[PDB]
Amino acid sequence: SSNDNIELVDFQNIMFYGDAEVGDNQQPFTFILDTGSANLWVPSVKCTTAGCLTKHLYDSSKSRTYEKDGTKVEMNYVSGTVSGFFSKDLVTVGNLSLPYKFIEVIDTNGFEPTYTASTFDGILGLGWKDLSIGSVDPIVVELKNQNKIENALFTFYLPVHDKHTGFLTIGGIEERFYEGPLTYEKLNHDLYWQITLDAHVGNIMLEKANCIVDSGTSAITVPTDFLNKMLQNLDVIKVPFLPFYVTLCNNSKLPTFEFTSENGKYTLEPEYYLQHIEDVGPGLCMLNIIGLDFPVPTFILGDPFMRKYFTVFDYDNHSVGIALAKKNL
Numbered sequence: 001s002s003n004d005n006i007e008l009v010d011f012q013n014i015m016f017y018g019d020a021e022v023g024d025n026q027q028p029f030t031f032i033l034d035t036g037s038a039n040l041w042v043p044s045v046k047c048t049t050a051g052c053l054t055k056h057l058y059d060s061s062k063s064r065t066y067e068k069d070g071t072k073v074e075m076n077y078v079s080g081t082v083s084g085f086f087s088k089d090l091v092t093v094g095n096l097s098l099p100y101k102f103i104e105v106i107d108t109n110g111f112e113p114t115y116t117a118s119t120f121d122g123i124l125g126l127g128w129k130d131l132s133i134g135s136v137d138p139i140v141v142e143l144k145n146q147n148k149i150e151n152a153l154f155t156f157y158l159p160v161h162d163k164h165t166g167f168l169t170i171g172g173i174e175e176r177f178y179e180g181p182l183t184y185e186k187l188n189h190d191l192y193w194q195i196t197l198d199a200h201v202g203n204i205m206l207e208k209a210n211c212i213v214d215s216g217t218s219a220i221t222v223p224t225d226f227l228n229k230m231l232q233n234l235d236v237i238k239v240p241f242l243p244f245y246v247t248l249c250n251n252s253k254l255p256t257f258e259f260t261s262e263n264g265k266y267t268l269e270p271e272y273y274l275q276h277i278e279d280v281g282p283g284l285c286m287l288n289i290i291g292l293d294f295p296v297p298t299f300i301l302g303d304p305f306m307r308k309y310f311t312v313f314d315y316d317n318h319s320v321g322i323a324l325a326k327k328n329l
């Protein structure tokens with residue numbers, strides 16, 4: 001068949017991770033595979049902060065193919081800076097390798113306590129060129145330019161806890177991952193993977209909303225007027241001053257999301273967006289839904305939508321393909 005398959009392992013419903021390697025000595029890292037960002041971030045041996053000391057670390061000096069670039073990278077994150085510099089070396093994802101401009105991270109003093117909390121070493125972006133720091137070409141675009149993959153496209157088939165493992169697949173579409181038709185939705189900007197759909201939840205309707213498909217987000221985010229409208233009378237309880245909503249897991253009044261285009265119709269039922277706190281039926285659950293206002297009405301179709309729908313990200317045809325994920329492998 002061909003095609004590069006990268007196993008996705010789940011970590012307690014919050015996130016999933018894939019393995020990649022750096023340098024020709026094959027230095028192993030755990031990565032967040034993030035369609036909402038466009039850079040490869042790797043922690044350096046020269047990083048000496050609590051947490052870096054818990055992570056797998058990059059050592060340029062052990063790698064014959066290291067290629068100095070040193071270009072300073074400064075990123076003032078929300079109260080605390082993340083900083084490093086550019087390096088080039090041989091990145092290996094699955095069974096493919098290529099030279100790539102990544103960011104060797106020196107300091108993580110604004111990505112805490114997030115970094116130490118989780119068990120990933122780095123972040124690997126999969127967005128578009130215009131979204132990167134420096135002007136780095138997307139890994140998949142490059143692999144196509146270097147004739148290593150058939151098509152400039154990747155797919156996500158996400159893990160489902162205690163059910164199956166998952167895959168990022170580079171280079172072509174694999175039939176085993178889905179059921180039903182595979183409809184395509186054209187990008188409306190080459191930045192995030194963003195498409196135009198009509199969003200409809202029972203009575204509430206919003207025509208031609210911007211929908212970002214993003215593996216790096218673990219909620220469905222929703223415009224706040226939408227959320228407010230849609231939660232009235234649902235027997236849901238809002239924990240005061242925090243983006244959390246608590247419900248019995250069997251609340252039969254929970255609504256289904258509806259996204260429609262000319263080409264297709266996508267729904268996301270309660271069972272896909274509930275987090276189970278406890279299952280002593282009727283169970284306690286939280287809604288995996290955040291209100292979030294963008295300059296333009298936007299939905300972030302994150303991990304919950306991707307768990308149900310298999311997704312194709314196509315650089316060549318400037319589009320996202322969506323199909324129902326096979327319940328099993």
Ligand SMILES: CCCCCc1ccc(C(=O)N(Cc2ccc(N(C)c3ccncc3)cc2)C2CCN(CCC(C)C)CC2)cc1
Binds near residue numbers: 015043105118212
């Ligand atoms: C070696 C470590 C270096 C990594 C440093 C770092 C780089 C980039 C980002 C970031 O902005 N990211 C990447 C990022 C990915 C995952 C996370 N985490 C870990 C996460 C996600 C979901 N749930 C829990 C935790 C944090 C940050 C953002 C996240 C928000 N995205 C929203 C896009 C939306 C479509 C508008 C844009 C990209 C953070 C830290």
